Amino acid sequence: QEPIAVLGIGCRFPGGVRSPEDLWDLVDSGGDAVGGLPAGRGWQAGSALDGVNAGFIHGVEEFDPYFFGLDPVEAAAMDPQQRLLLETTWEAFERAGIDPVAARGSRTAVYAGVQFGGYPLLMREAPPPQVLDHLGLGNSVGAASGRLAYQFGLLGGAVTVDTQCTSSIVALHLAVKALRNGECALALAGGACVMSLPTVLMDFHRRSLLAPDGRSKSFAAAADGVSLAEGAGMLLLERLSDARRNGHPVMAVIRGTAINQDGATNGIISPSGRAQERVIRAALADGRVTADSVDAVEGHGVGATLGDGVEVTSLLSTYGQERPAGRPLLLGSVKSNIGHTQTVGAVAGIVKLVMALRNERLPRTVHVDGPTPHADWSSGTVRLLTEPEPWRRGERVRRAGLTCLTLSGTNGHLILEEPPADEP
Amino acid sequence: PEDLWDLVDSGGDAVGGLPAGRGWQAGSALDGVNAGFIHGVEEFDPYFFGLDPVEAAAMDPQQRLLLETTWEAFERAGIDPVAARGSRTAVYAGVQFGGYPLLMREAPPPQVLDHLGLGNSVGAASGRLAYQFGLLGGAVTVDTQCTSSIVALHLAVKALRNGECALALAGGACVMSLPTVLMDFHRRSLLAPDGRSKSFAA
Amino acid sequence: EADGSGEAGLARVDWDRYLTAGHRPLPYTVLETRASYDEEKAPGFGQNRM
Amino acid sequence: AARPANPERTVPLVLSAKSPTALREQAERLRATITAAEPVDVGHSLHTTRSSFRHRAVVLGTGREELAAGLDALAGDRTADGLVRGVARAQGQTALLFGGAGDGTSGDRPADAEGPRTARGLYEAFPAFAEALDEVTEHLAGLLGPEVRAAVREPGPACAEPTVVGQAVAFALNTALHRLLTAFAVRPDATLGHGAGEVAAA
Amino acid sequence: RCWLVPPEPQVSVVAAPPHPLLGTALDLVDATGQSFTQQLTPGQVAGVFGQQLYGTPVLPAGARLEWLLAAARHGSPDSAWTLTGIRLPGTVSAASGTPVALQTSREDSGDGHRVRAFVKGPGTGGGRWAERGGATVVPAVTRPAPDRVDPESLPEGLAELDVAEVYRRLWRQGSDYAEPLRVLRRVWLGGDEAVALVGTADVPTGPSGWSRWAAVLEAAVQLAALSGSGPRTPVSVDRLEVSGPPSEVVWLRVRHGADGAADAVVLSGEGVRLAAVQGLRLRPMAGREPAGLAEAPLERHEVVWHALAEDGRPGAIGGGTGSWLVFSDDPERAAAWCDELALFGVPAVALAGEDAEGRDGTETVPVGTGDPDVVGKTFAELRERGVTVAGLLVHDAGDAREPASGADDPLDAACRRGGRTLALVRGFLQEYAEQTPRIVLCSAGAAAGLAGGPPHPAQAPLTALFTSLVWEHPELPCAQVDLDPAEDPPTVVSLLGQVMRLPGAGRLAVRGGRWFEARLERRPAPADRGERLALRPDATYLVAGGDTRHAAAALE
Amino acid sequence: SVPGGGRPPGQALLSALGELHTDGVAIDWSQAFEGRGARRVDLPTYPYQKVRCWLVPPEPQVSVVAAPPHPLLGTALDLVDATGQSFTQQLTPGQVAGVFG
Ligand SMILES: O=C(O)CCCCCCCCCC(=O)c1ccc[nH]1
């Protein structure tokens, strides 16, 4: 039950976002980032991607090899995912106000969410003989968490994890438990997702799973399909007591966390629904936070036609029973502005809620023509945030939750709170 | 465990010749290389676990060995797997991407193509165990090269101590579907020329 | 083949043609597998519809 | 263990498999282990550390020499006394038939003494039966006088003969065997009673 | 920039997909005419070779005809074409899992626009390239043709058939078609012509553009073969003329008016002429050799007895639907089983042969006279009493005729046993088959290969008569049970019980308390044992009882 | 019959229940062992009935030349109507600098 402080966040997200401040400008202006296929990647796609729209990091094919002390040959051999984590971790220490030279030798742990991106399969020819020697460590999933710790000279634990889309919420749960266990002094948690090969967009298009206009219309009645997008992000964490001893900034406090599987039984009982209703209870208990005290939730909201309805049902079964008068649970999802973001969906959500706390407003969910008919809104105890509302500091401590789901059956929840923010 | 004890107590070793039966396109690039193989990793029993044989052909051999080895673990733990369904058991597997779809010298049949995804994504290897046995705990895969097994144990020990779960399953798998890691270790001359790990000897 | 060989022979035959040639509306357990029985299967991994 | 001494009472040894050939291979494995451990400990293990699949077999024997002959009979697939085989169909669908004393006077009356004269041996053989029979027997004595207690201990021809003592012993033994079957977890969906013994079915 | 592969151009050509039989053109510098080459991988073969003859994959005749048209039209945008003097030797075939090389060429004839095309089939290993089709090409057809004909006017002279029986007729001609080539949707046939409705003929590359002609032309072969009898395959066509790609529906007409040759015309849904074919001959390859084309190996086939140790419990007899008839060589056995069926509440009647004594109050039947009429005139009397029959048991005494007659002749005994059993069984089938009775033949010591004593040869007509029923009255359920000839016979409720668990037909046997069932099963045959064999030199050998053709080969 | 069976009185009841267990009833055998000296032991695990499950059909064990094509001469064609042999190569951009020294 020690609270864990987010000291700083760094990220790259669709539509030219490079900082938490940029993501705020994008959501508060109600824009969306989904666009055309990238040029400049080696993609010789057939007719199979004609009309496919998605969210891409423009410029992932560019890097600055000299700043991190690499040979340009090695910088070419590395998976784009390893490079985004490395570039984002420097930005994470800088906004946290820590000198990377003072971080050397620290008991900082690393917990990275990464999935194998297939990068060397772009080659038509056999590789040049100088590149070949670097291709092993350049593309192994286990090397991604090791490289960060070598570059920044960190001496704590280092792990790469994979759990499909929940990989960032699972990485963050391990980092929170590590800091509470007393294993490490700081912890670095996050992930990356970059489409070096087109094959995942082709696999979703062949099965007709994508929305036709490429929008994840989160919780709306339109509900046409999902939308794949890229993204990368790192959070730096420390125990709240140690953060206040040193005098580092606190942007938000992580209070409680949980993970579960949705098991295996007949789909008629809604097994993924029962799984969410246990995982929320577990996360509230881990943080010792009462279910009336949460104001809002950054829902998974991917736009799958039944799945958003199972999520809305699970929230009514779990939060929607004990609401104070005039305090109905506000629901939204960042996937509406930037697409699904695959492995980093939890970081995108945390950046939104961290910026919402700092600016005393909750942003609207875009493209909501009317609420989804697959769940019962008749309690009035839960609603979509269809016009933005104020969220002032005051006598009630502000709190919010995040959810992530995936088809392999992992589910999770996090609770966030205000910084204590003592007067200057 | 008893087979390992018989080998070890009789003072033998188990490094030998390269596998037949796997479809390997290794020319002279593995000539004279010796290594330790699981014979018959290409053979499996789909009807026991409830898989149609085309899905059982789509799966990476690493997902198959973990699934087989888990049943044997429960049968010695004295727990009937039918009694374990609905338990708060967590799964932590040390696993790596095996490249198994790259064995195919041609585009696959359209029946197997739609199963290769969850057949070969590393993050499926935790979830599929939890599905087959109906386990409700957290289910993660970890990778840090050789140490991926200690990392899985450490996270499982810390999960049980913190009261997250009632049981935990921790371990890993490694199979050479493709020859390429042996080709490169031979190319850079890292292998002993007689193939033995002379562990601390002169 | 000293004993226990039964009725035994040597030829090129495809029995799936043979039992469908002429015509036959009911099973014949000398060539056909005897019967079905009560068992059930899961909807597969990843699939979670309805 | 502080393990008690005993006479060589029969052991029920249970095997199950998901297909027929696997049952026969399981008998060849287990036949090499019943030689080392005591049969009561092997039977207690297989009842509890294993699942209950669709293809089934049961072997009965007093000791190691008989049980080995049963497992060999399964392994070669040949019928022998004390071996039973079959394929389960999952539905419950069970009913239980009860009868009065006096119908044993209709014909072959000494066989309806010899059944009850055999049935007395169950009192030493099983824990659940003795307490049930004793509870009924001491409960009946207050309606009848002491001679019913001798009659339950000496179940001769009275069990076949239309008499108050005969009907009392018949109700006692039927009630006791019903508690025996429910201790073995057989649960009836229907009951039928023939003649004056209908009270037992009720 | 830090990336492995340099970036793609802002604009590029579509690089259109090749037709799978002709592949990508070669670029030899000095060559007199164009050539093209392909390898089919073992996975691709099943999509291109859409037809099976006797299990082996073969290339459809409409596909060879389209291959020549695709080879012809490669150099020009022109929408109408003509092929003449078309010849298609042999069968293109590919044994399961093998590679298939293909090659094709074009040569200018020097006669203005006239060009020659050829196709050559797989060279591999010690084998060499061989011709598999040739045609002459004349471009720019540039001639008028008839005005529209209403497709709905065409069928009136002919009966309609179910498309299921159309493909079953082709199955009885050795041929089966994969789903992409099952393009028929309605068919009419009779006399010297046929007409048909053809769906979207969507071969590989066929969902749009010219390639759809492969399966439209193959429908003309399917329909042309449907009119004949005995297996046959296309060999020549004298003209093919085509304009445009075929519409999503087309109508075919096929006629047999030329001496040994078909003509065919393809019409659009609007009644426009799409293509025509003249002088289509199958007759020069009527009845070509299946034994060289069949996929199956030489194997050893054996009737193996499996115990019913799994599920071996009798189950109930099927209720009071009608009586059971019991006939036996022994009046005491017939009576005993009629007493047993009475204890179980099943109605039964006892029958005996009229050369046996009427010892135990049975009916009597003239079995022993070889004639089904006098037997039938006896069974008809039971129907006139109002008796109804569920089934019939015939029980044989086994070796007991040997000590009873006091002399041995197993071949005369077999002649008698056949004659008796035939008289009973035929006589019964004539009188009751509309009731769907069940027939059970109960031999003893007839089953081969089982343990416990030798088989008795005089039983053999019973196993023959059982299989003689199974294929000739295929709607009637029946079974043979073979008893042990020396152990005591089982309770009749056990026999009938286990037999009522079989729908259809089967062979069962009893030895001890076990029930067994026969299955015909297969294993590889080591013919190389004979390749190592030589017979001993200091001996004589007999070849006996054969004709000239068998004897000459035995002597060889 | 539940009381009736073979001569030892326990074998009758255990066989009668054994047939019900065999047919499918979920019988709890623990009363046969209760009050007796029973322990627990490690026993052999389930015997799998394995079959080949692999994407690729097994390759034939034939020896062949390791790298036969010469960098300029390339592949020899088998054009059927040819008067004499012709050979072709395409060089990819990364090969060109290796052959052109
Ligand atoms: O820690 C050590 O000393 C052991 C090093 C072993 C590294 C093995 C990495 C294997 C990754 C294979 C892979 O990611 C792949 C193969 C084909 C396509 N991708």
Author numbering:
A (entry chain B): 33 to 456
B (entry chain A): 52 to 253
C (entry chain B): 1670 to 1719
D (entry chain A): 457 to 658
E (entry chain B): 912 to 1467
F (entry chain A): 861 to 961
Quote the original article.
The cryo-EM map of CalA3 with the hydrolysis product was resolved at overall resolution of 3.97 Å and the hydrolysis product was captured only in the KS domain of chain A. The carboxyl oxygens may form hydrogen bonds with C197, T438, and L439. Additionally, the carboxyl group of the hydrolysis product could also form a salt bridge with H372 at a distance of 5.4 Å which also demonstrates the positioning function of H372 predicted by MD simulations. To consider the pyrrole and the carbonyl group of each chain as one unit, it is shifted ~6.5 Å and rotated ~53.6° from SNAC-N1 to the hydrolysis product, which the latter is able to further translate ~6.4 Å and rotate ~74.4° compared to the amidation product. The polyketide chain moieties are subtly moved within the range of 0.6 to 2.2 Å between the SNAC-N1, amidation, and hydrolysis products. The accumulation of 2, the hydrolysis product, was also observed. Similarly, a motion of this unit combining movement of ~5.8 Å with rotation of 34.9° is also observed compared between the amidation product and SNAC-N1.
The domain organization reveals a unique “∞”-shaped dimeric architecture with five connected domains. The catalytic region tightly contacts the structural region, resulting in two stabilized chambers with nearly perfect symmetry while the N-terminal docking domain is flexible. The ~360 kDa megaenzyme uses only the KS domain to catalyze one C–N bond formation (or hydrolysis) and subsequently release the polyketide chain.
